[PDB]
Ligand binder design. Structure first.
Ligand SMILES: [Mg+2]
Ligand SMILES: [Mg+2]
Ligand SMILES: [Mg+2]
Lengths: 127, 41, 237, 85, 42, 53, 81, 285, 321
RNA sequence: AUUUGGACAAACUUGGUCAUUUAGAGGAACUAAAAGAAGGUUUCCGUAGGUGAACCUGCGGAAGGAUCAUUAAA
């Protein structure tokens, strides 16, 4: 009596995606971003915006029939930071409060065995 | 303003705890000065 | 940013009206695992109703934890991909498609002051499934060891790698895909590697890290039915 | 309590306690009240930059558009027929 | 200098407008009209 | 008003969202090579503001 | 002359921003339609259509299901709360 | 109550010279005639502008800081030269400047390059300009063909004017001292202006100064340059990628410049290259 | 058959026109293939007339001043002409025009109808061409006439054409494109009369002054510019909008101009001096549609939320008080 | 297609004649004018560049540049 989806959270430096799908992942149920929930660009990555997105997604899940989700949280990865930020942690807490069973939580950041050059240059970036 | 460069004895919860709840030390000396001035007089 | 202050974009001009809820036209489908796994029910998926439903369902890959499939947390750090091959009366019949570890378990195993030994082989089963195995092992220190580290000489590493490749090739070739899966679950391959490499160098955390399925034979419904262990309709009146 | 300035902008309230609406005053009474205030005021850094600019006449301001305007904010601007006629 | 004057003189024979030419800066990118008044007035 | 764990090349900063972004800029300036004395000066400017608000 | 002063009359949508189905009374006179987190009870009497009531929860939670009794005396609705 | 307008164009948020010899030397080298109207860029407090006001018919001062404009105003109120000064406040690059014979500038170095070409393109341009730039930028105006600092700016500016070094000003002569060295230079725009289209001259220079110390043939090897030139050839016909390749090859071979470096070429070599391209119908811009 | 239909909402409205023999009806070009017509409320209008002739959402809409003709531009690359049938008191599909490669984004009808029917139809499309279609003379068969040949086809712009405006005397028409330029075409030949290139962002609307030789254009640069058609130069630039200006119209003949912005505010300007007289704030979303009646005595604006504001001039009432 | 003549008649040029706004400079009236601080920037080497250059940038290298906490295990 427990139907499972997959809540795929993508916490970037400038935004947060909360994306629920079926177990296969080919089928989308609800995708909401923090930029759909705030009035200023500066706040799209905020923990506040990620909480509104997750509650918006959790309600749609309960309607469709999903009662549980597995969580696959990720950061940008690649040549950039590998750990999901505060926005992603905020969404995961919001889903837990929402009333959906949380099945299994995994970090699936794309980690290169080897990388191309990062965008900064020789002197660095992110002043 | 002086910025402390030593480890804070108060834990991160405490620094928020006290925020939930012109200076006493400045007034503490003021009492001491009055005591010293009164005794000297 | 949905505020009024946000500058108008070109793409806002003409937008389709939301006049149909997509989930009205979706149909749910049950996913069933091969008989090698103890817990056959692995959830359900949905697809647009046939106008066909089968075409979109076939080729669909679902990955699940072995702990769910076996009901034991000893397999919490291993995942199994299952690919839908046949659909019968809302039941999606799946077959082994791959296996992999969680990212946390791998990072847990990789530690400082020891040697990381990894081997891979491309080999085919007796059923003509071409697959690639990845094995990982680490050197360990002895009970009375006093050195801080447990590094192995490159001669040992090549010797251990040669032994592991010999074992991986032997097990896969002399077995079918279903039988190979039955070897992965009890981690019997790893114990075989441990025994063979015992006289070369002590090892720890010997695991078959990953399994890829590179090529597949012609699909045979009869073989799939047997792996899962026809139905007349009911007159409509 | 002490009587102060008029709360409304259309009235004069003195410290004597007497209020005077500008509408009810005759013209002669409005003149002396104007001169009475002048006596009271007579005996009684960016802004300093602004007034110096406004005081001088040979000053032209160029806005972001490149158009030429005076310190006041109005656009700064011989013919034989005009001078002869 | 005398060579400069000759070359400059010969250029005017081959001179054109440049509005349509793509700039080399692009190398990096790689009734009457007012009849309505008339009806209301009458 | 944050706490920082400097585990070899791995930096963890614990605090409120607006605060840990303030801490991150100072750490990034140090990594990019700004001398500690100059960084300590900027910290005083922001620290003064934090008490005001 | 110049046309500066203008007086406006607003026409809001009655039924929008929700998956809930509108309901009508048995006689067909009263129509209740959800608009986001608000409900518009509307009289359908010809020549005198008007908004009888405006119900606003203010909780921001949308209306999931909405039902008006056949006699029209009661309105029952459920929210996401 | 002018705060309304001046606050809408300025927000009311420099290295000041401290050597009178530099200020004096500039004005003497200008050689201002008594019938000359002078544009003065960067009046500062007014140390120089009073000196120009003494010997010039009229002086037009352009300033960017409202405070510095007021300081200029105070230094000339109720004086015989108050009637000869006109202060233009605000960004003077967008505005259309009046006619003037001489330009004496304590330039903000940020606007050095735009200014040098604003004067050159000024209709009826000034006959002499005494401009102060930084050493690195100044030396590129003064660079000769075959020098290391020869570049696009050197070739372009030398086609419309002649630039001559006057003196060097060190960082010590300013307070607070800047981190770069300064230099005072003379610019003389040519009258009559040479009858070469600015777009054609600059257009050719840009393609060939992408790598100044690389052969001219390689400059025309880039695909994007070929695409740009191919379209321009099409435009010429309107009033063929393989064809353009052959046309460029012949011009570079015949002029014997295809194996030369732009850093070691003078005006004539570019002019011969420009003319030869026109004969084959390739107009750069 | 359906006796009557109630409109819960009208979606997002792209354009509006006053239609019908008494001009009491309001035709809407929403994000729906159907042409909606609603009655102008007395100053709740639940009723709506839904006409279905198109296959995809309607980009734009135009109508003749009598109100008996409507032209609808659709995203299915076709344009329909509708005629009012007094017998049934409803509009009927009169003609269809099929020859465009991409969506038809703007459409235009004559401002002078002397034969009793409009004689041409101007259309613009995302294929970046403008076509002049002739409208057939009415025929008793009352069967839809499908036309696939246009009087001329001219390549107009490099980016999508956003608006099309027709002059009072049907001598010229203007197209506004998101390539930052407005072009004026001779209506009889399609020859490019002029190009008005001064804005810094792409243009959203263009409006001829129906009385004097003036043109107003609105851009994403938050400004409106008034152009002299004799000299083809900017006479005024109107600033004050916080966001992009999507609609602009002349009211009170030459005197005033009304504009709508993505910020949701409607401003009334004085064309002679170019300063904002009044700001109307009744909307909480962008305004794609703005229609006026009786030279700006009545103004209708439609929000993206689906809210109509009906503004009525009341100056003389205020002045008397 | 094209031609003659007869009315209708758009649109153009012109001097007038009417009505409406409207630019500078004068002349001469009336009314109004109740306020009162400080605050961005490691030092270089080789090489290559620079047209909003009081300095910027690409590549490789150096310290002649300020090491806290946890940490053997069980
Ligand atoms: Mg940042
Ligand atoms: Mg260097
Ligand atoms: Mg070395």
């Amino acid at each position: 009596s427990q139907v499972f989806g997959v809540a795929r959270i993508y916490a970037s430096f400038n935004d947060t995606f909360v994306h629920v799908t079926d177990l296969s992942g080919k089928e989308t149920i609800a995708r909401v971003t923090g930029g759909m929930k705030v009035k200023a660009d500066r706040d799209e990555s905020s923990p506040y915006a990620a909480m509104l997105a997750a509650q918006d997604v959790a309600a749609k899940c309960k309607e469709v029939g999903i009662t549980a989700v597995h969580v696959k949280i990720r950061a940008t990865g690649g040549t950039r930071t590998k750990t999901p930020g505060p926005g992603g942690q905020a969404a995961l807490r919001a889903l837990a409060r929402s009333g959906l069973r949380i099945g299994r939580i995994e970090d699936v950041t794309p980690v290169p065995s080897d990388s191309t050059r990062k965008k900064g240059g020789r002197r660095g970036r992110r002043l | 303003f002086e910025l402390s460069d030593v480890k804070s004895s108060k834990s991160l919860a405490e620094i928020y705890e006290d925020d939930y709840t012109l200076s006493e030390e400045l007034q503490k000396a003021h009492s001491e000065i009055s005591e010293l001035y009164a005794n000297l007089v | 940013a949905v505020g009024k202050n946000k500058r108008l974009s070109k793409g806002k001009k003409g937008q389709k009206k939301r006049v149909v809820d997509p989930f009205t036209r979706k149909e749910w489908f049950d996913i069933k695992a091969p008989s090698t796994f103890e817990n056959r029910n692995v959830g359900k998926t949905l697809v647009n109703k046939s106008t066909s439903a089968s075409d979109a369902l076939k080729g669909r890959v679902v990955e699940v934890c072995l702990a769910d499939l076996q009901g034991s947390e000893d397999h919490s750090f291993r995942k199994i991909k299952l690919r839908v091959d046949e659909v019968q009366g809302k039941n999606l019949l799946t077959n082994f498609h791959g296996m992999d570890f969680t990212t946390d378990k791998l990072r847990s195993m990789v530690r400082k002051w020891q040697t990381l030994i990894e081997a891979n082989v491309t080999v085919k089963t007796s059923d003509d499934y071409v697959l690639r195995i990845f094995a990982i092992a680490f050197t360990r220190k002895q009970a009375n060891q006093v050195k801080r580290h447990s590094y192995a000489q490159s001669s040992h590493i090549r010797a251990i790698r040669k032994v592991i490749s010999e074992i991986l090739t032997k097990e896969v070739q002399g077995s079918t895909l279903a039988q190979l899966t039955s070897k992965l679950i009890p981690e019997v391959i790893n114990k075989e590697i441990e025994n063979a490499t015992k006289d070369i160098f002590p090892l720890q955390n010997i695991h078959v890290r990953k399994v890829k399925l590179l090529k597949q034979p012609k699909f045979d419904v009869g073989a799939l039915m047997a792996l899962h262990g026809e139905e007349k309709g009911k007159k409509v009146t | 309590y002490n009587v102060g300035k008029a709360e409304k902008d259309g009235e004069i309230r003195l410290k004597n306690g007497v209020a005077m609406s500008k509408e009810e005053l005759t013209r002669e009474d409005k003149n002396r009240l104007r001169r009475a205030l002048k006596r009271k005021r007579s005996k009684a850094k960016r802004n300093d930059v602004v007034d110096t600019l406004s005081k001088a006449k040979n000053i032209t301001v160029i806005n972001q558009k490149g158009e030429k305007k005076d310190v006041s904010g109005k656009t700064k601007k011989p013919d034989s027929t005009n001078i002869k006629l | 200098r005398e060579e400069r004057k000759t070359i400059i003189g010969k250029l005017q024979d081959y001179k054109i407008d440049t509005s349509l030419l793509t700039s080399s800066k692009r190398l990096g990118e790689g009734k009457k009209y007012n009849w309505r008044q008339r009806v209301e007035m009458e | 008003r944050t706490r920082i764990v400097l585990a070899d090349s791995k930096i963890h900063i614990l605090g409120g969202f607006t605060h840990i972004r303030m801490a991150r800029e100072s750490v990034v300036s140090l990594i990019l090579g700004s001398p500690p004395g100059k960084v300590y000066g900027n910290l005083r400017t922001v620290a003064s503001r934090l008490k005001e608000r | 002359d110049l046309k500066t002063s203008y007086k406006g009359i607003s026409l809001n949508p009655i039924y929008a921003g929700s998956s809930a189905v509108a309901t009508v009374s048995e006689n067909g006179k009263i129509l209740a339609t959800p608009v986001l987190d608000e409900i518009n009870i509307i009289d359908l009497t010809p020549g005198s259509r008007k908004i009888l009531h405006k119900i606003s929860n203010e909780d921001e939670q949308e209306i999931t299901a909405l039902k008006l009794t056949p006699d029209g005396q009661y309105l029952t609705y459920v929210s996401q709360a | 109550s002018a705060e309304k307008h001046l606050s809408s164009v300025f927000k009311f948020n420099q290295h000041i010279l401290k050597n009178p010899l530099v200020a004096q030397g500039i004005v003497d080298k200008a050689q201002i005639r008594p019938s000359d109207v002078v544009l003065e860029v960067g009046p500062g407090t007014g140390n120089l502008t009073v000196r120009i006001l003494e010997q010039a018919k009229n002086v037009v001062a352009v300033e960017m800081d409202p405070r510095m404009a007021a300081e200029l105003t105070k230094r000339v109120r109720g004086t015989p030269v108050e009637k000869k000064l006109e202060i233009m406040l605000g960004d003077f690059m967008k505005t259309e400047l009046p006619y003037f014979d001489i330009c004496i500038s304590n330039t903000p170095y940020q606007i050095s390059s735009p200014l040098v070409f604003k004067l050159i393109n000024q209709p009826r341009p000034p006959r002499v300009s005494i401009l102060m730039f930084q050493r690195e930028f100044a030396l590129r105006l003064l660079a000769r063909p075959g020098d290391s600092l020869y570049c696009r700016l050197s070739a372009n500016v030398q086609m419309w004017a002649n630039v001559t070094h006057i003196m060097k000003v060190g960082k010590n002569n300013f307070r607070p001292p800047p981190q770069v060295e300064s230099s005072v230079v003379r610019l003389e725009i040519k009258n009559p202006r040479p009858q070469v289209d600015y777009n054609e001259w600059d257009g050719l220079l840009r393609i060939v100064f992408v790598r100044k110390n690389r052969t001219i043939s390689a400059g025309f090897k880039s695909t994007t340059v070929m695409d740009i030139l191919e379209k321009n050839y099409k435009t010429f016909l309107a009033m063929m990628h393989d064809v353009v390749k052959e046309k460029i090859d012949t011009v570079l071979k015949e002029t014997d410049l295809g194996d030369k470096r732009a850093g070691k070429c003078d005006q004539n070599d570019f002019l011969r290259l420009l003319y030869a391209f026109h004969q084959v119908g390739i107009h750069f811009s | 058959q359906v006796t009557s239909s109630i409109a819960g909402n009208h979606g997002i409205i792209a354009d509006m026109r006053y239609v019908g023999p008494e001009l009491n009806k309001l035709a809407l070009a929403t994000n729906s293939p159907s042409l909606r017509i609603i009655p102008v409320p007395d100053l709740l209008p639940l009723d709506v007339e839904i006409y279905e002739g198109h296959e995809d959402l309607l980009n734009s809409l135009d109508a003749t001043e009598d109100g008996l003709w409507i032209a609808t531009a659709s995203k299915d690359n076709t344009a329909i002409v509708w005629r009012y049938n007094e017998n049934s008191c409803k509009f009927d599909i009169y003609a269809k025009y099929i020859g465009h490669s991409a969506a038809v984004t703007a459409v235009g009808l004559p401002n002078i109808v002397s034969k009793g029917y409009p004689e041409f139809l101007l259309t613009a499309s995302n294929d970046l061409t403008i076509k002049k279609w002739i409208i057939p003379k009415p025929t008793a068969s009352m069967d839809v006439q499908i036309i696939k040949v246009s009087e001329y086809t001219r390549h107009a712009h490099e980016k999508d054409i956003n608006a099309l405006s027709v002059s009072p005397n049907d001598s010229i028409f203007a197209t506004a494109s998101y390539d930052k330029t407005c072009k004026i075409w001779n209506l009889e030949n399609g020859e490019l009369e002029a190009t008005l290139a001064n804005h810094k962002r792409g243009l959203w609307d263009v409006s001829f002054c129906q009385y004097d030789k003036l043109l107003a254009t609105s851009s994403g640069d938050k400004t409106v510019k008034i152009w002299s058609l004799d000299t083809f130069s900017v006479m005024k630039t109107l600033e004050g909008h916080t966001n992009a200006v999507q609609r602009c119209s002349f009211i009170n003949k030459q005197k005033q101009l009304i504009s709508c912005g993505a910020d949701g505010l409607i401003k009334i300007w004085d064309c002679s001096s170019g300063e904002c007289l009044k700001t109307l704030d009744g909307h909480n979303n962008r305004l794609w549609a703005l229609s006026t009646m009786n030279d700006g005595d009545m103004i209708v604006s439609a929000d993206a939320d689906g809210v109509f504001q009906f503004w009525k001039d009341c100056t003389e009432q205020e002045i008397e008080e």
